[PDB]
Coordinates of C-alpha atoms and ligand atoms in Angstrom, one line a residue:
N1 CA 96.7 86.5 100.4
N2 CA 98.5 84.3 103.2
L3 CA 98.3 87.1 106.1
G4 CA 98.5 84.9 109.3
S5 CA 94.8 86.1 112.5
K6 CA 96.6 88.1 114.4
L7 CA 99.1 91.5 113.3
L8 CA 101.0 93.4 113.6
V9 CA 101.2 96.6 111.5
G10 CA 104.1 99.2 111.5
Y11 CA 104.3 102.2 109.0
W12 CA 108.1 102.5 107.8
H13 CA 109.6 105.9 107.2
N14 CA 110.2 106.6 103.8
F15 CA 111.7 109.9 105.1
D16 CA 113.9 110.5 108.6
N17 CA 112.4 112.7 111.0
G18 CA 114.8 112.5 114.0
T19 CA 114.6 109.0 113.7
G20 CA 116.5 107.5 111.2
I21 CA 116.0 105.5 108.9
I22 CA 115.7 101.8 108.4
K23 CA 116.7 99.5 105.3
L24 CA 113.9 96.8 104.3
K25 CA 116.0 94.2 105.5
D26 CA 117.2 95.7 109.2
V27 CA 113.2 95.7 110.1
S28 CA 112.4 93.4 112.6
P29 CA 111.1 90.0 111.3
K30 CA 108.0 90.9 113.9
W31 CA 106.6 93.0 112.1
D32 CA 103.6 91.2 109.2
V33 CA 102.7 93.7 107.4
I34 CA 105.6 97.3 106.5
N35 CA 103.6 100.4 105.0
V36 CA 105.3 102.4 103.1
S37 CA 104.7 105.6 104.4
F38 CA 105.0 108.1 101.6
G39 CA 103.1 107.7 98.4
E40 CA 102.9 112.1 97.8
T41 CA 101.7 113.8 95.7
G42 CA 102.8 117.8 93.5
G43 CA 101.1 120.3 92.1
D44 CA 98.1 117.7 91.0
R45 CA 96.9 116.7 93.5
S46 CA 96.5 113.1 92.1
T47 CA 99.5 112.1 90.9
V48 CA 101.1 110.1 93.5
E49 CA 105.3 109.7 93.3
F50 CA 107.3 108.1 95.7
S51 CA 111.2 107.4 95.1
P52 CA 112.7 105.4 98.0
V53 CA 114.7 107.7 100.9
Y54 CA 117.8 105.2 100.2
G55 CA 119.8 103.2 97.4
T56 CA 118.7 102.3 94.0
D57 CA 115.3 101.7 92.4
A58 CA 115.9 98.6 91.5
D59 CA 117.5 97.8 94.9
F60 CA 113.8 98.7 96.8
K61 CA 111.9 96.2 94.5
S62 CA 114.9 93.4 95.9
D63 CA 114.7 94.1 99.3
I64 CA 110.3 94.1 98.5
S65 CA 110.9 90.7 97.3
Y66 CA 113.3 89.0 99.6
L67 CA 111.1 90.5 102.4
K68 CA 108.0 89.2 100.5
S69 CA 110.0 85.8 99.9
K70 CA 109.7 85.5 104.1
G71 CA 106.9 86.0 104.1
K72 CA 105.7 89.1 104.6
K73 CA 104.2 91.8 102.9
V74 CA 105.0 95.8 101.4
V75 CA 102.6 98.5 100.8
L76 CA 102.5 101.5 99.8
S77 CA 100.9 104.2 102.1
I78 CA 99.5 107.2 100.6
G79 CA 99.5 110.4 103.1
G80 CA 100.8 112.5 105.0
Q81 CA 101.8 116.3 104.8
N82 CA 103.0 116.2 101.0
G83 CA 100.3 113.1 99.3
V84 CA 97.4 115.1 99.9
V85 CA 95.0 113.7 97.5
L86 CA 92.0 115.2 95.7
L87 CA 90.3 114.0 93.2
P88 CA 87.1 116.3 92.2
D89 CA 86.5 114.4 89.3
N90 CA 86.5 111.5 86.5
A91 CA 90.3 113.2 84.9
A92 CA 91.6 114.1 88.7
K93 CA 90.9 110.1 89.4
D94 CA 92.5 108.5 86.4
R95 CA 95.1 110.2 87.4
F96 CA 95.6 108.3 90.9
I97 CA 94.7 105.1 89.8
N98 CA 96.8 104.9 86.5
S99 CA 100.0 106.6 89.3
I100 CA 99.3 104.0 91.6
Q101 CA 99.3 100.9 89.4
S102 CA 102.4 101.9 87.8
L103 CA 104.2 102.3 91.3
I104 CA 102.5 98.7 92.5
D105 CA 103.9 97.3 89.2
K106 CA 107.4 98.9 89.5
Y107 CA 108.0 98.4 93.0
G108 CA 106.3 95.4 93.5
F109 CA 103.9 96.8 96.8
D110 CA 101.4 93.4 97.7
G111 CA 98.7 96.5 98.2
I112 CA 98.3 100.4 99.7
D113 CA 97.4 101.6 102.5
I114 CA 94.6 104.9 102.9
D115 CA 95.8 107.1 105.3
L116 CA 94.6 110.4 104.3
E117 CA 93.2 113.2 105.5
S118 CA 93.4 116.6 104.6
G119 CA 90.6 116.6 101.6
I120 CA 87.8 113.8 103.2
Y121 CA 85.3 115.5 104.2
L122 CA 81.5 115.1 103.3
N123 CA 79.6 118.4 101.5
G124 CA 75.6 119.2 102.5
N125 CA 73.1 116.9 102.0
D126 CA 75.4 114.2 101.0
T127 CA 73.5 112.0 104.4
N128 CA 74.1 108.4 103.0
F129 CA 76.5 106.6 103.9
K130 CA 75.7 103.8 101.6
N131 CA 74.9 105.7 98.5
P132 CA 77.1 109.1 99.2
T133 CA 77.5 112.6 97.3
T134 CA 81.1 114.2 97.3
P135 CA 83.0 113.7 95.0
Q136 CA 85.6 113.6 97.0
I137 CA 84.6 110.5 98.3
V138 CA 82.7 108.7 95.6
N139 CA 86.2 109.1 93.5
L140 CA 88.3 108.0 96.2
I141 CA 86.1 104.9 96.2
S142 CA 85.9 104.2 92.7
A143 CA 89.3 104.4 91.8
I144 CA 90.0 101.9 95.6
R145 CA 87.9 99.7 93.5
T146 CA 88.9 99.8 90.7
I147 CA 92.7 99.2 91.4
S148 CA 91.6 96.4 93.1
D149 CA 90.2 94.8 90.9
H150 CA 93.2 95.6 88.6
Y151 CA 94.8 93.1 91.2
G152 CA 92.9 90.5 92.6
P153 CA 91.2 89.2 95.6
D154 CA 95.1 88.6 97.2
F155 CA 95.3 92.3 96.9
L156 CA 95.6 93.9 100.5
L157 CA 93.6 97.3 101.4
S158 CA 94.2 99.3 104.4
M159 CA 93.6 102.5 105.7
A160 CA 93.6 105.0 109.0
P161 CA 91.4 107.1 108.9
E162 CA 91.3 109.1 112.5
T163 CA 88.7 108.4 115.0
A164 CA 86.3 111.8 114.2
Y165 CA 85.9 109.9 110.6
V166 CA 85.0 106.8 111.7
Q167 CA 83.9 106.7 116.2
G168 CA 82.8 110.8 115.0
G169 CA 79.9 109.2 113.4
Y170 CA 78.3 108.3 115.6
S171 CA 78.4 112.4 117.0
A172 CA 77.4 113.6 113.8
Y173 CA 77.6 112.9 109.7
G174 CA 78.7 115.3 107.8
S175 CA 81.9 117.6 107.6
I176 CA 84.9 115.4 108.5
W177 CA 82.2 113.5 110.9
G178 CA 81.4 110.2 110.0
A179 CA 83.6 111.0 106.8
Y180 CA 85.5 108.0 106.3
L181 CA 82.0 105.6 107.1
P182 CA 81.4 105.8 103.1
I183 CA 84.7 105.2 102.1
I184 CA 84.9 101.4 104.4
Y185 CA 80.9 101.3 103.3
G186 CA 81.6 100.4 99.3
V187 CA 85.4 99.0 99.3
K188 CA 84.0 96.5 102.8
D189 CA 84.5 93.7 99.9
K190 CA 88.1 94.7 99.4
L191 CA 89.2 96.0 102.3
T192 CA 91.8 93.8 104.3
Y193 CA 91.5 95.4 107.7
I194 CA 91.1 99.1 109.0
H195 CA 93.3 100.2 111.2
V196 CA 91.7 104.0 113.0
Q197 CA 94.6 105.8 114.7
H198 CA 93.3 105.8 118.1
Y199 CA 96.2 108.8 119.1
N200 CA 95.9 112.7 119.0
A201 CA 92.2 111.9 119.5
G202 CA 92.0 113.6 122.9
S203 CA 88.9 111.8 123.9
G204 CA 85.9 109.8 122.7
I205 CA 82.2 109.0 122.0
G206 CA 81.4 104.6 123.2
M207 CA 78.1 103.1 121.3
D208 CA 77.5 103.9 125.3
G209 CA 76.6 107.8 125.0
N210 CA 79.9 107.8 127.6
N211 CA 83.4 109.9 126.6
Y212 CA 86.6 108.0 126.5
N213 CA 90.0 109.4 127.2
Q214 CA 92.4 108.7 124.6
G215 CA 95.5 106.2 126.0
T216 CA 93.2 103.9 128.4
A217 CA 92.5 100.5 128.2
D218 CA 88.6 101.2 127.8
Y219 CA 89.3 104.0 125.3
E220 CA 90.1 101.2 122.9
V221 CA 87.5 98.7 123.2
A222 CA 85.4 101.3 123.3
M223 CA 86.4 102.8 120.0
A224 CA 87.6 99.5 118.6
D225 CA 83.5 97.6 119.4
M226 CA 81.7 100.2 117.4
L227 CA 83.5 98.8 114.4
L228 CA 83.3 95.2 115.8
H229 CA 79.1 95.5 116.2
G230 CA 77.8 98.4 114.3
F231 CA 76.7 101.5 115.5
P232 CA 74.0 103.8 115.5
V233 CA 74.8 106.9 113.0
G234 CA 74.6 111.0 114.2
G235 CA 72.0 110.5 116.5
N236 CA 69.2 108.4 114.1
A237 CA 68.3 104.8 115.7
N238 CA 67.7 104.1 112.0
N239 CA 70.9 104.5 110.6
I240 CA 72.9 101.6 111.2
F241 CA 76.7 101.4 110.1
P242 CA 77.4 97.6 109.7
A243 CA 79.8 95.7 111.6
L244 CA 82.9 94.8 109.8
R245 CA 84.4 91.3 110.2
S246 CA 85.8 91.1 113.7
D247 CA 88.9 90.0 110.9
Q248 CA 89.0 93.7 109.9
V249 CA 89.3 95.5 112.5
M250 CA 92.2 96.7 113.9
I251 CA 93.7 99.4 115.8
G252 CA 96.6 102.7 115.5
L253 CA 98.4 102.6 118.9
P254 CA 101.7 105.5 118.6
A255 CA 105.1 102.8 119.3
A256 CA 106.3 105.5 122.0
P257 CA 104.5 108.6 124.2
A258 CA 106.7 111.0 121.4
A259 CA 105.1 109.3 118.4
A260 CA 101.7 110.4 119.7
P261 CA 103.2 114.6 120.4
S262 CA 99.1 115.0 121.0
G263 CA 99.1 111.9 123.5
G264 CA 97.0 108.0 122.8
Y265 CA 99.8 106.5 124.1
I266 CA 98.9 103.9 126.3
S267 CA 101.4 101.1 128.2
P268 CA 101.2 97.5 126.5
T269 CA 100.2 96.5 130.2
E270 CA 96.8 98.4 129.8
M271 CA 96.7 97.6 126.7
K272 CA 96.8 93.9 127.6
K273 CA 93.4 94.1 129.4
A274 CA 92.0 95.9 126.7
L275 CA 93.7 92.7 124.1
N276 CA 92.6 90.6 126.6
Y277 CA 88.6 92.1 126.5
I278 CA 88.5 92.6 122.9
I279 CA 89.7 89.2 121.5
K280 CA 88.6 87.0 125.1
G281 CA 86.0 88.6 126.4
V282 CA 87.7 88.4 130.1
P283 CA 86.9 91.9 131.6
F284 CA 89.2 94.4 133.3
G285 CA 87.3 96.0 135.9
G286 CA 86.5 98.7 133.3
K287 CA 83.7 101.2 132.7
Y288 CA 83.0 100.3 129.2
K289 CA 81.1 96.7 128.4
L290 CA 81.6 95.3 125.6
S291 CA 78.6 94.8 123.5
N292 CA 79.3 90.6 122.6
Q293 CA 80.3 88.9 126.3
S294 CA 81.9 85.5 124.5
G295 CA 83.9 88.4 122.2
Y296 CA 85.5 89.1 119.4
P297 CA 88.2 86.0 118.6
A298 CA 88.9 86.8 114.9
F299 CA 90.1 90.7 116.2
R300 CA 93.0 90.9 113.9
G301 CA 95.5 92.9 115.9
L302 CA 97.4 95.5 116.5
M303 CA 98.8 99.1 114.0
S304 CA 102.2 101.5 114.6
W305 CA 102.6 104.8 113.9
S306 CA 106.0 103.4 113.5
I307 CA 108.2 100.9 113.0
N308 CA 110.9 103.8 113.1
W309 CA 109.4 104.9 116.3
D310 CA 109.5 101.6 117.6
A311 CA 113.3 101.1 116.8
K312 CA 113.8 104.1 119.1
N313 CA 111.9 103.2 122.1
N314 CA 113.9 99.6 122.9
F315 CA 112.0 97.6 120.4
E316 CA 108.8 98.5 123.5
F317 CA 106.2 97.9 120.6
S318 CA 106.6 94.6 119.1
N319 CA 107.7 92.9 120.8
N320 CA 105.3 93.7 123.3
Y321 CA 102.8 92.7 121.5
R322 CA 104.5 89.7 119.4
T323 CA 104.6 87.9 122.6
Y324 CA 101.4 88.7 123.3
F325 CA 100.2 87.1 120.3
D326 CA 101.8 84.8 120.0
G327 CA 101.0 82.9 122.9
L328 CA 97.6 83.8 122.2
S329 CA 95.6 79.7 122.2
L330 CA 92.2 80.4 121.0
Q331 CA 90.1 77.1 120.5
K332 CA 87.9 77.4 118.2
Ligands
LIG401 ZN1 95.0 115.1 112.4
LIG402 ZN1 92.7 96.8 85.3
LIG403 ZN1 98.6 112.4 112.0
LIG404 ZN1 74.6 93.6 119.8

């Protein structure tokens, strides 16, 4: 896929929410991947649809080809308030698969991003993340594998679940708690990276059993470390969720305070402390102790909601973190 080792992945508003529309060619080159937000659904909650917020279909395709020629990736994100996906059975699953492939074919997207919240949860008795039994989860995994298999090894697959669905699995396994764990595990060989939303999250319990507060360096390290290292699920020491490759692990952050109205924004100064600890093993006097002393140098980078918020906030996120990653001189 020719993706770099330290990425900035930015969500791109296919809409004007007050922050304005940025045409694709006007997006800062500091973003490596652009997650077009969002493919949406109608009555049947399964047929995904997408139309460019500006200009014609042909021109949007051309814009995407241009970006791709510059080494960027353009990914279709599925989710948002108007992108609820429900796959209770095979019929629904097929509408989903076919509609997504049609959109990828039409616009030349490099892959898809799963940003689903509503609709995802574990049924009773669904107890094993390696072998899920909830139809929504089973069918989403199947659809994702089918789509990725359709496009081959270069297909880009990402996802942006909220913490309850991933790290929350440390506390409970059922309902929304840990509900993305089977999805992640089920598609791990196809997964390019996961960027959990470390925002609008309140607090989170680390693998050390301690509580950490969103928007702090300790919290960022504690939450990422769970995917970098793996962790016991639902208080069961014998049910360990395995580590992902470090190059599959990113952290999702708000570009500006207002990009996450319930909190989660962290200053670049504090975030760089977290990054230096995660990547280089260099501590910063925090309470959280990293699982691997020497660090996880192949940690993949940062995601942000969003490109549009970033541009409205003096490009603080993109400028700070591009410089940080560009300045790394990792040896190994
Ligand atoms: Zn939410
Ligand atoms: Zn096929
Ligand atoms: Zn949300
Ligand atoms: Zn260990």
